[PDB]
């Protein structure tokens, strides 16, 4: 509890006092950090160097984050610059006997910092300039377990020198478990690595050949990443350095021999034309195998190696097409039936023309198969009915094809069941015979297909058990109220982004098409520009949430047009209304009387309300999350108690409010959430913010406003000092606009003794003038009386 902007978190059972100064623009480490802290965070700031006095009296530290104080030239933002790289003073971390982690990613260091404590377990030196490692600098790290030495030399952080490794640099690190040498311009794997390895990340480097004595001692390794070595970078958006003569990564047949406990092996972008089954001879517990961006278009037709993969879970074979070849069909081998435990199978980038039913014959007996991704293949003809055999599947991805009817933080309808993702294809009209034998489908994605058709209730007939419908980025013409009528079990409908036919004026728009939907629970109709509707009301006995943003309601609720005032009135069970971004300039008095009775979530964000009425909120006796963000309203209500007694999540972000009422939160007990950030509010008084109601607020925001922190409301300056109310960004964002020398000041670090306190100054002045006049009168009378 101090004036520091770093967020504090206390956990007694874990003995964890976490202080986080994430992205606060620090210049030096602030003083007064408690000795009970264990996790420390100093990310993107402006810290010049580290001194032994930085962590002097702190001995209970276990995690220190010093990531990306000033990133390299193209690795981050160009608006924050450091005059020079980071310099580590000697004996800067040995005083931390309880240290177990250190993050120094993105500090442009030239060598590994020396003097680290032996209790150090985690270490990361990514995005730095270390391109040479020695044993004399690693002898102090004989107890580390996690070592992240990646992103040191590549196309974004160049060093112009190959990654040099002296012999047996990582040998004496018997406790090291994972090693990441990614993006370091590595030429050869550092032999020899410790036998206690568990993850080896040498991916995205320049290794051209693999030795038979490379992984000879790694018997406990579980994940091995060799992706990007000799890559296939045709039409790549990033600078690449391919191998000589377009040769793939040279891995011997007897290279993965000692690797028994290996579970994940990624070989993405290795220009691999052949993969012998001898590589998978000794590894029996492989779960994930990535082979993307390779030349395996001829190997996928054979695929003998899969006869040695009985426990495989994931198999990524994406983007294996050969250039300037548009195959007429996809060739899968029968060995695809040998991956008993296969779950996820993505065959993207396998460009071909026609997908026949018998082309997926080896996949007809995979009981554990749940994912079947076949997108980005430019498939033209594909009979959907053939998917009547993949009923046990979970997702059926048919995306942008033309079908026709390492913990490192940077510095849908899958929950409903079976889905058929037909997004961004070439369907321009929907027929009932096309979706035949597809009753088991719980979801259906038609987004981005641009279907121009008026539905009369006979298109999606075989879809009896459908529960989710995506119809975004299309052109639906709402002529009949019987649209989607045959969808008896449909719960969620997405008709958003269909502004074409709804923009036209004169044609009918039967918005009451939800009456025939008895189990519909959600409806997305955003970005439709609906300006007219022949139906006066909307009917639905089960719709609870309605997203109605991105339209035109200033014309439907136009002055004098009382026809569309009770649009959402018949929505009996509606509890979440998202009518926003509709250019609503003023609220017509009477629409709140035609609002759903069970309405709980009302949002009016990014509209343009010039004057929002508040006394009309009494008609909504169930509203709790009124959202009025990014508006243009000016005056706050007089008394929030007389306006509503169930509202608790008032959100007033990015509006133009100058000052609150004298009794804003008077007797308002039910509210637990309020936002007044990015405003022009200048003063807040106690009569409007009494502690009896402020004691229960879960969250309150008052940042990015124009507070003039003068003495005129001195107790306000005191109220922020001694009061326990969750106000985030209290020291870096909510600042002072004035006056004069007090500009840029934080509200928590304010203390104004300017105003006289209890009126003792007047008493003293009165006493002084009385004493003076009394002495004058007494002396004059004494002179007169002699």
Swiss-Prot record:
Disulfide bonds: none
Residue positions the entry lists as glycosylated: 36, 39, 137, 172, 185, 331, 383, 445, 456, 512, 601, 642, 721
Activity modulation notes: Activated by guanosine analogs including deoxyguanosine, 7-thia-8-oxoguanosine or 7-deazaguanosine in a RNA-independent manner. Activated by imiquimod.
One MF annotation (Gene Ontology) recorded for this entry: siRNA binding
Transmembrane stretches, start-end: 762-782
Ranges in the topological domain labelled Extracellular: 1-761
GO-annotated cellular components: cytoplasm; early phagosome; endolysosome membrane; endoplasmic reticulum; endoplasmic reticulum membrane; endosome; endosome membrane; Golgi membrane
Record bears the keyword Endoplasmic reticulum: yes
Compartments in which it is found: Endoplasmic reticulum membrane; Endosome; Lysosome; Cytoplasmic vesicle, Phagosome
Sorted UniProt keywords: Cytoplasmic vesicle, Disease variant, Endoplasmic reticulum, Endosome, Glycoprotein, Immunity, Inflammatory response, Innate immunity, Leucine-rich repeat, Lysosome, Membrane, Receptor, Repeat, Signal, Systemic lupus erythematosus, Transmembrane, Transmembrane helix
UniProt keyword Transmembrane helix, yes or no: yes
Segments annotated as LRR repeats: 13-34, 35-57, 80-96, 97-119, 121-140, 141-165, 173-196, 198-217, 218-245, 259-282, 284-307, 309-338, 339-362, 366-389, 391-405, 414-437, 438-462, 463-486, 488-510, 517-540, 541-566, 571-594, 596-619, 620-643, 645-667, 668-691, 694-717
GO biological process: canonical NF-kappaB signal transduction; cellular response to mechanical stimulus; cellular response to virus; defense response to virus; inflammatory response; innate immune response; JNK cascade; positive regulation of canonical NF-kappaB signal transduction
Involvement in disorder: Immunodeficiency 74, COVID19-related, X-linked: An X-linked recessive immunologic disorder characterized by impaired type I and type II interferon responses due to defective TLR7 signaling. Individuals with TLR7 deficiency develop severe respiratory insufficiency in response to infection with SARS-CoV-2 coronavirus. Death from respiratory failure may occur. Systemic lupus erythematosus 17: A form of systemic lupus erythematosus, a chronic, relapsing, inflammatory, and often febrile multisystemic disorder of connective tissue, characterized principally by involvement of the skin, joints, kidneys and serosal membranes. The disease is marked by a wide range of system dysfunctions, an elevated erythrocyte sedimentation rate, and the formation of LE cells in the blood or bone marrow. SLEB17 is an X-linked dominant form characterized by onset of systemic autoinflammatory symptoms in the first decades of life.
UniProt comment concerning the protein's domains: Contains two binding domains, first site for small ligands and second site for ssRNA.
Biological function: Endosomal receptor that plays a key role in innate and adaptive immunity. Controls host immune response against pathogens through recognition of uridine-containing single strand RNAs (ssRNAs) of viral origin or guanosine analogs. Upon binding to agonists, undergoes dimerization that brings TIR domains from the two molecules into direct contact, leading to the recruitment of TIR-containing downstream adapter MYD88 through homotypic interaction.
Quaternary structure note: Homodimer. Interacts with MYD88 via their respective TIR domains. Interacts with UNC93B1. Interacts with SMPDL3B.
Protein name per Swiss-Prot or TrEMBL: Toll-like receptor 7
Protein source organism: Homo sapiens (Human)
Included stretch of the parent chain: 31 to 864 of 1049
């Amino acid at each position: 509890p101090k004036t520091l902007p770093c967020d504090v978190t206390l956990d007694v059972p874990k003995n964890h006092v976490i202080v986080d100064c994430t992205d606060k623009h620090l210049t030096e480490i602030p003083g007064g950090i408690p000795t009970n802290t264990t996790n420390l965070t100093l990310t993107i700031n402006h810290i010049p160097d580290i001194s032994p006095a930085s962590f002097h009296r702190l001995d209970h530290l276990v995690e220190i984050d010093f990531r990306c104080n000033c990133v390299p030239i193209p690795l981050g933002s160009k608006n924050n610059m450091c005059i020079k790289r980071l310099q580590i003073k000697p004996r800067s971390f040995s005083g931390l006997t309880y240290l177990k982690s250190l993050y120094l990613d993105g500090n442009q260091l030239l060598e590994i910092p020396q003097g680290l404590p032996p209790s150090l377990q985690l270490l990361s030196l990514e995005a730095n300039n270390i391109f040479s490692i020695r044993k004399e600098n690693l002898t102090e790290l004989a107890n580390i377990e996690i070592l992240y030495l990646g992103q040191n030399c590549y196309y974004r952080n160049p060093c112009y020198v190959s990654y040099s490794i002296e012999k047996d640099a990582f040998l004496n690190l018997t406790k090291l478990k994972v090693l990441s040498l990614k993006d370091n311009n590595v030429t050869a794997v550092p032999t020899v690595l410790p036998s206690t390895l568990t993850e080896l990340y040498l991916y995205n480097n320049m290794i051209a050949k693999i030795q038979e004595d490379d992984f000879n001692n790694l018997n406990q390794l579980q994940i091995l990443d060799l992706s990007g070595n000799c890559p296939r970078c045709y039409n790549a958006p990033f600078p690449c350095a391919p191998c000589k003569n377009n040769s793939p990564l040279q891995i011997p047949v007897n290279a993965f021999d000692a690797l028994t406990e290996l579970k994940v092996l990624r070989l993405h972008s290795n220009s691999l034309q052949h993969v012998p089954p001898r590589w998978f001879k000794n590894i029996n517990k492989l779960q994930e195998l990535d082979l993307s961006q390779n030349f395996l278009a001829k190997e996928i037709g054979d695929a003998k190696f899969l006869h040695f993969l009985p426990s495989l879970i994931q198999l990524d074979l994406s983007f294996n097409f050969e250039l300037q070849v548009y195959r007429a069909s996809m060739n899968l081998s029968q060995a695809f039936s040998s991956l008993k435990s296969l779950k996820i199978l993505r065959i993207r980038g396998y460009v071909f023309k026609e997908l026949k039913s018998f082309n997926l014959s080896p996949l007809h007996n995979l009981q554990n198969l749940e994912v079947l991704d076949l997108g980005t293949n430019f498939i033209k003809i594909a009979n959907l009915s053939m998917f009547k055999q993949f009923k046990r599947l979970k997702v059926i991805d048919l995306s942008v094809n033309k079908i026709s009817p390492k913990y490192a933080r940077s510095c849908s309808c899958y929950k409903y069941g079976q889905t058929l993702d037909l997004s961004k294809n070439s369907i321009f009209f929907v027929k009932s015979s096309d979706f035949q034998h597809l009753s088991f489908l719980k979801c259906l994605n038609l987004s981005g297909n641009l279907i121009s058709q008026t539905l009369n209730g006979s298109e999606f007939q075989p879809l009896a058990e459908l529960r989710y419908l995506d119809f975004s980025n299309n052109r639906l013409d709402l002529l009949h109220s019987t649209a989607f009528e045959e969808l008896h079990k449909l719960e969620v409908l997405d008709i958003s982004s269909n502004s074409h036919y709804f923009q036209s004026e004169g044609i009918t728009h039967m918005l009451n098409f939800t009456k025939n939907l008895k189990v519909l629970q959600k409806l997305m109709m955003n970005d439709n520009d609906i300006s007219s509707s022949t139906s006066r009301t909307m009917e639905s006995e089960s719709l609870r949430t309605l997203e109605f943003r991105g339209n035109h309601l200033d014309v439907l609720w136009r002055e004098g047009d009382n026809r569309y005032l009770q649009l959402f009135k018949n929505l009996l069970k509606l509890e979440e209304l998202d009518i926003s971004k509709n250019s609503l300039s003023f609220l017509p008095s009477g629409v709140f009387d035609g609002m759903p009775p069970n309405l709980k979530n009302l949002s009016l964000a990014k509209n343009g309300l010039k004057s929002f009425s508040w006394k009309k909120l009494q008609c909504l006796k169930n509203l709790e999350t009124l959202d009025l963000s990014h508006n243009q309203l000016t005056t706050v209500p007089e008394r929030l108690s007389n306006c509503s007694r169930s509202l608790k999540n008032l959100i007033l972000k990015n509006n133009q409010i100058r000052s609150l009422t004298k009794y804003f939160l008077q007797d308002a007990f039910q509210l637990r959430y309020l936002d007044l950030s990015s405003n022009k509010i200048q003063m807040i008084q106690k009569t409007s913010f009494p502690e009896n109601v402020l004691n229960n607020l879960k969250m309150l925001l008052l940042h990015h406003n124009r507070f003039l922190c003068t003495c005129d409301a001195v107790w306000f300056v005191w109220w922020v000092n001694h009061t326990e109310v969750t106000i985030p960004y209290l020291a870096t964002d909510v600042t002072c606009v004035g006056p004069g020398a007090h500009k840029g000041q934080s509200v928590i670090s304010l203390d104004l003794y300017t105003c006289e306190l209890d009126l003792t100054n007047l008493i003293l002045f009165s006493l002084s003038i009385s004493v003076s006049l009394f002495l004058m009168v007494m002396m004059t009378a004494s002179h007169l009386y002699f």
